[PDB]
Symmetry: C3
Subunit: 227 residues, 3 copies
Amino acid sequence: TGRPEWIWLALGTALMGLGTLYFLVKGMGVSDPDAKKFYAITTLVPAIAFTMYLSMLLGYGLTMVPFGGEQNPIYWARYADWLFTTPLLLLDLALLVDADQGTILALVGADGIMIGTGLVGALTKVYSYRFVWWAISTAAMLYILYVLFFGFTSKAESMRPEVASTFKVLRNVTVVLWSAYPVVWLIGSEGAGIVPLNIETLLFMVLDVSAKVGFGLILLRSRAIFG
Amino acid sequence: TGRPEWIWLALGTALMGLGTLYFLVKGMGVSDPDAKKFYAITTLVPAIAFTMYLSMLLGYGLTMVPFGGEQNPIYWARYADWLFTTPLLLLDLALLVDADQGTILALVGADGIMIGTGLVGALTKVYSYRFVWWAISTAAMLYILYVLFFGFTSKAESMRPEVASTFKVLRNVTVVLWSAYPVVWLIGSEGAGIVPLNIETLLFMVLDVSAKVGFGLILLRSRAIFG
Amino acid sequence: TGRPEWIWLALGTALMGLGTLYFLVKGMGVSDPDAKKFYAITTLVPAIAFTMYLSMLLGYGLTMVPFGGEQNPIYWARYADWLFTTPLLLLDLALLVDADQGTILALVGADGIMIGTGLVGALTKVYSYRFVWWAISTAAMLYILYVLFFGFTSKAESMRPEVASTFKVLRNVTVVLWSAYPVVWLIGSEGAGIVPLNIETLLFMVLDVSAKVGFGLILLRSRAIFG
Ligand SMILES: CC(C)CCC[C@@H](C)CCC[C@@H](C)CCC[C@@H](C)CCOC[C@@H](CO[C@@H]1O[C@H](CO)[C@@H](O)[C@H](O)[C@H]1O[C@H]1O[C@H](CO[C@@H]2O[C@H](CO)[C@H](O)[C@H](O)[C@H]2O)[C@@H](O)[C@H](O)[C@@H]1O)OCC[C@H](C)CCC[C@H](C)CCC[C@H](C)CCCC(C)C
Ligand SMILES: CC(C)CCC[C@@H](C)CCC[C@@H](C)CCC[C@@H](C)CCOC[C@@H](CO[C@@H]1O[C@H](CO)[C@@H](O)[C@H](O)[C@H]1O[C@H]1O[C@H](CO[C@@H]2O[C@H](CO)[C@H](O)[C@H](O)[C@H]2O)[C@@H](O)[C@H](O)[C@@H]1O)OCC[C@H](C)CCC[C@H](C)CCC[C@H](C)CCCC(C)C
Ligand SMILES: CC(C)CCC[C@@H](C)CCC[C@@H](C)CCC[C@@H](C)CCOC[C@@H](CO[C@@H]1O[C@H](CO)[C@@H](O)[C@H](O)[C@H]1O[C@H]1O[C@H](CO[C@@H]2O[C@H](CO)[C@H](O)[C@H](O)[C@H]2O)[C@@H](O)[C@H](O)[C@@H]1O)OCC[C@H](C)CCC[C@H](C)CCC[C@H](C)CCCC(C)C
Ligand SMILES: CC(C)CCC[C@@H](C)CCC[C@@H](C)CCC[C@@H](C)CCOC[C@@H](COP(=O)([O-])OC[C@H](O)COP(=O)([O-])O)OCC[C@H](C)CCC[C@H](C)CCC[C@H](C)CCCC(C)C
Ligand SMILES: CC(C)CCC[C@@H](C)CCC[C@@H](C)CCC[C@@H](C)CCOC[C@@H](COP(=O)([O-])OC[C@H](O)COP(=O)([O-])O)OCC[C@H](C)CCC[C@H](C)CCC[C@H](C)CCCC(C)C
Ligand SMILES: *C\C=C(C)/C=C/C=C(C)/C=C/C1=C(C)CCCC1(C)C
Ligand SMILES: *C\C=C(C)/C=C/C=C(C)/C=C/C1=C(C)CCCC1(C)C
Ligand SMILES: *C\C=C(C)/C=C/C=C(C)/C=C/C1=C(C)CCCC1(C)C
């Protein structure tokens, strides 16, 4: 349940919070209309993360699901968070690399399903079924990382070296990080309880802050966001 | 409840699933940026349909509402599905016919209300009230079919004959199909139980697959989607 | 609970309803593509307000939350309403003043959090915690009114006098009205029950109709919406 992992939630809330502050206090006097978009998209990611992390800390984002012949502590707020933050991150990559509206739409769709599926899985009562939803969700995820890796990289090659390189870093960071989530989910309390909610929460915490604050940092501190 | 209609759900899940596969395996090597958009929008429709049909089959999308002095089997997942798939379909028509942003916005709004209202109706406990929500939802629907029929057709007349004709087919197919839903809802378990959930599910199944896979087929196999 | 304030809900439902009708019956024969957008955005605001007000009147939008060592009557539908209507209103201001996509995105984000936070607050069981969420929600709100007041006004100064002035009126009306909500929430049943749900409902009613129908009226009856 929620108590031993109260601390990881606390640190997460705080890190996202400061992350918002730092990104907010930096894009204040930014004239560049394109850079303006990047700060907006990027800043909104940690801000949302902050509200959802606070709901877990205060006990709201946590619920109980019966499965495995018992009651289970499921932090649902993660899906509420990700549902918006993942597309926003994706949007950042698309703008940076000037992707086609079609692909953005396809990418956003894939993402919504990825989280939608993950959320449903996290709540389904037939233990067994939770793993099907996981399968679907991961399939959706993989599609995204594919397009990002082979599709987006290609589009980056046409931009100026600054953008190509920043994208390369961002690309590597999201591909590697995003794929850890399904592994954590799988071995955590949402799936086979191989790992305690204690460590799991510390894991999502590190992954989230990296995948958002870190990503924001890499992106917002490069000249790539400028026209 | 969910058992006698388990089969229609199963076939639906499967048909949507293959529908996604087929549309996915066809727009792979498509350079045309406009055609790319059409495949994205269209492909996402059956994909969502698949996840929601699977939730009904696995028992998740089903809930119980007390009304009529008794418990009632309400597949809520349909609204979760439609909420996204109906606008997407609408968006397809708008792109094809190059509609004004204003009308798209108005059309999307109408749709969200149409489903939002339908969902609320499906869940309201005062039997009587379910019919008011139905009224509102249908009113919203009618507005949409109106704009599609008289507004969009007009905009199609300015496109090349290929587009005008494909739109005509699509227009006829959506106008006729969409209007069956409110009739099914009305006579099914959501309203006056004149028809059993058994047949009702077989009905939504046929309507959905036609309105999505069929629509996708008609659209994605014409040269209308190209610039 | 829901009974003594049944009337304010009834009048609200009716006022929004007519508000939709009036805005609908006025933008019918409007060729101007820009004006078309304004009518669409603006008309959808009261229309949504109508469906949510009807849910409160019919008893659906009302729920019960335990806090303060007792059961509490919480009209949740307000958040469902606002979640969409507030951005739409914001979008109106942005179009009118031709704001940057970045700022619109930032503004929409802030708003979603503002309502999301408000909703969570309205539902949190630890009385005490409801006030933190209020704090966050208001902080988000303030950010919005700031950008609207100092940012948007600046952008209005570049438009023709008609637009600058209409915006000025709209700006003053939203800044003043929006800031009353957090005060009402604070002193109403969602926070410290200093004011009865009776008067509270009459308050939100006046604020809503003004902030939407009034706003719509001021905007839709000026030549500012034309190109
Ligand atoms: C952009 C649009 C305008 C989009 C729409 C966005 C929105 C709708 C997304 C929602 C997304 C999904 C993923 C989240 C929902 C998950 C869902 C399955 C879980 C829902 O449950 C929580 C919900 C309601 O809370 C509850 O109220 C009901 C009514 O009164 C009750 O019937 C429920 O039981 C109650 O649940 C709570 O309490 C439970 C407590 O039980 C226990 O009690 C015992 C008593 O002895 C003891 O105390 C135990 O300890 C205790 O646990 C608990 O178990 C439950 O979990 C629950 O807490 O909550 C509503 C959440 C709200 C929707 C979150 C919003 C997220 C943030 C703010 C979003 C910011 C987004 C903006 C929009 C982004 C903008 C950028 C774009 C432009 C890209
Ligand atoms: C784009 C944005 C980023 C937009 C936001 C999208 C999202 C928020 C939309 C939601 C839309 C609405 C329409 C769906 C919600 C309907 C709502 C009224 C119904 C909610 O209930 C289900 C919800 C939660 O499940 C539950 O968990 C709670 C917390 O722990 C519990 O308190 C509930 O009770 C529990 O409910 C389940 O179980 C019930 C079981 O009871 C019974 O138990 C007995 C025991 O003996 C026995 O077993 C009985 O047989 C059994 O029934 C059951 O009755 C309930 O129905 C329920 O199953 O679920 C969350 C669903 C999730 C939000 C669905 C998402 C849909 C898909 C994946 C969307 C893909 C969308 C992308 C975004 C599209 C992209 C394209 C655009 C760009 C255009
Ligand atoms: C654009 C996208 C495509 C975006 C997605 C939009 C959508 C998902 C947004 C949702 C936003 C949030 C803010 C609203 C949800 C708030 C949430 C916390 C509250 C949820 O509860 C209500 C929910 C389900 O109702 C219930 O069914 C469950 C399953 O069967 C049950 O388990 C619940 O208990 C049940 O709750 C009801 O009944 C309770 C009754 O208890 C009591 O019973 C006793 C008996 O003796 C006695 O009778 C008592 O008097 C009685 O009270 C009650 O307490 C509960 O409150 C509840 O009524 O409802 C689903 C609502 C639906 C999602 C509202 C939609 C809003 C409108 C139509 C939106 C129009 C939007 C379009 C999209 C805008 C377009 C423009 C853009 C382009 C900008
Ligand atoms: C049981 C199952 C049936 C159910 C599945 C579960 C499912 C719900 C989850 C999957 C997610 C799914 C929702 C995703 C939908 C995607 C769909 C909307 C995509 C539509 O398609 C949009 C395109 C975007 O195109 P581009 O990449 O940008 O190409 C640019 C080119 O260089 C030209 O540029 P120019 O114009 O300037 O000249 O997708 C990108 C094109 C790519 C370059 C090519 C991609 C190929 C695919 C990866 C392979 C096809 C899929 C496989 C046969 C199997 C399906 C697996 C599933 C996991 C995807
Ligand atoms: C109790 C009730 C009060 C509550 C009602 C319930 C309600 C919640 C459900 C209804 C759905 C509602 C939410 C829909 C909102 C719609 C609103 C946003 C629309 C705003 O309006 C946007 C326009 C889009 O314009 P266009 O069609 O594209 O015109 C192009 C022209 O050719 C010029 O081209 P050029 O620029 O190139 O020169 O709507 C299209 C303009 C059309 C051509 C004309 C349409 C006329 C209407 C159908 C008639 C007006 C309505 C009726 C008086 C009664 C209301 C019934 C209700 C069912 C709509
Ligand atoms: C907080 C920021 C980000 C980038 C979060 C990303 C989360 C994911 C990519 C989650 C993926 C999931 C999969 C693939 C399947 C199991 C369920 C998850 C939702 C955890
Ligand atoms: C799955 C694909 C589509 C095109 C589904 C369309 C569904 C509708 C048009 C439903 C309309 C409804 C009305 C008009 C009123 C009763 C409730 C419904 C939601 C069933
Ligand atoms: C119906 C139309 C509008 C413009 C409604 C606006 C509502 C708000 C600005 C609400 C703000 C809130 C704050 C700042 C904090 C407490 C909770 C609220 C959601 C009431």
